[PDB]
Amino acid sequence: NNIIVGMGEALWDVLPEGKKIGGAPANFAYHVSQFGFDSRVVSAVGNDELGDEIMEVFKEKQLKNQIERVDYPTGTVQVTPCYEIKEGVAWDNIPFTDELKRLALNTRAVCFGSLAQRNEVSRATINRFLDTMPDIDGQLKIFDINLRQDFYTKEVLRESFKRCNILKINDEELVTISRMFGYPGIDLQDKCWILLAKYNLKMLILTCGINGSYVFTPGVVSFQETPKVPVADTVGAGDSFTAAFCASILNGKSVPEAHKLAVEVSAYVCTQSGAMPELPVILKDRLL
């Protein structure tokens, strides 16, 4: 089966200058659909104006979804270089429905993060989705760990490492994990090797910002420099990386080919103001 799912938060980044849609899930779903995949955003919003607004934007972007309405406000991040991630919100309460069960059974690749597991309701839904979803036929379960503030526990991380088969992590988050799990003093690569082997990962993607990015597979490292481009805004670039990497791997590309496309896609997205720019056709051609 066939469907690619981005699952987690969907919210408004409410800046003094106005508000903007945010959420790694929708961004991943969007970018994977640029590469011809049938994608769904799985989240929840409130029966409120902000929720209606989100749903209209996704309609406008032609972004297909299985978003439920729940009895909690649509999520927001109040922005002040500082972020208040409002709690007790709709995306903390994504329900595990009969329909979501069926979606999980039919899902080819999913990407999920840590933030949307902070609350017991969404955490339970996410884990049940993953445990329902098959993986014996090359399906991808991508944990784009994305640590936010202090919204993570050791148990949430450990269970997610167990459920995923691809981890995407940055070099500072890798330091944090290594501290939590008792190997802080070793080499960067050795930290990655532990995670790759311990959790039987197909791949581990390590991003190091201006210092490039790595993809680890057993016995093999792929490394790419980060291009310097004229940044408009980096919003959505990391999600577009994950989406392009996913698309490439599912298309049958090698890891080095996937890694290269992911870097180029991220670089392009950084040149654009919004999180969901239409991708260049010459980058889409890479999956021919």
167, 45 in Cβ contact below 8 A? Answer: no
d(C-alpha 45, C-alpha 57), whole Å: 13
d(C-alpha 236, C-alpha 230), whole Å: 15
d(C-alpha 217, C-alpha 225), whole Å: 18
253, 261 in Cβ contact below 8 A? Answer: yes
Host H or E run for residue 220: strand 220-224
Q: Which residues of 242-268 are buried (b: 16+ CB within 10 A; e: fewer)?
A: bbbbbbbbbbebebebbbbbbbbbbbb
Q: Which residues of 88-118 are buried (b: 16+ CB within 10 A; e: fewer)?
A: ebbbbbbebeeebeebbeebbbbbbbbbbbb
CA distances from 272 to 31, 102, 115, 233, 269 (A): 14, 36, 26, 6, 5
Question: Around Cβ 66, how many Cβ atoms within 10 Å?
Answer: 18
User: CA dihedral defined by 107, 113, 114, 120, rounded to 10 degrees?
Assistant: -40
Pull the structure tokens for residue 154: 């050791």
Record the resolution, in angstroms: 1.8
Burial class of residue 153 in the structure, from the number of CB atoms within 10 Å of its CB (0-12 exposed, 13-18 middle, 19+ buried) = middle
Domain hosting 96: range is 1-288
For residue 12, what is the domain's CATH number? 3.40.1190.20
User: CA dihedral defined by 177, 183, 187, 192, rounded to 10 degrees?
Assistant: -50
| Technique used by the depositors | X-ray
Q: Given its phi and psi angles, is residue 236 left (phi above 0), alpha (psi -120 to 50 degrees) or beta?
A: left
d(C-alpha 154, C-alpha 157), whole Å: 5
Pull the structure tokens for residue 105: 């059974």
Q: Are β-strands 75-79 and 38-42 bridged in parallel, bridged antiparallel, or unpaired?
A: unpaired
Closest CA to 168 of 198, 148, 192, 149: 192
Pull the structure tokens for residue 216: 């680890």
Alpha helices per DSSP H over 112-170? 120-132, 154-163
Closest CA to 222 of 197, 248, 189: 189
Pull the structure tokens for residue 23: 């959420």
211, 173 in Cβ contact below 8 A? Answer: no
Into how many domains does the chain fold?
A: 1
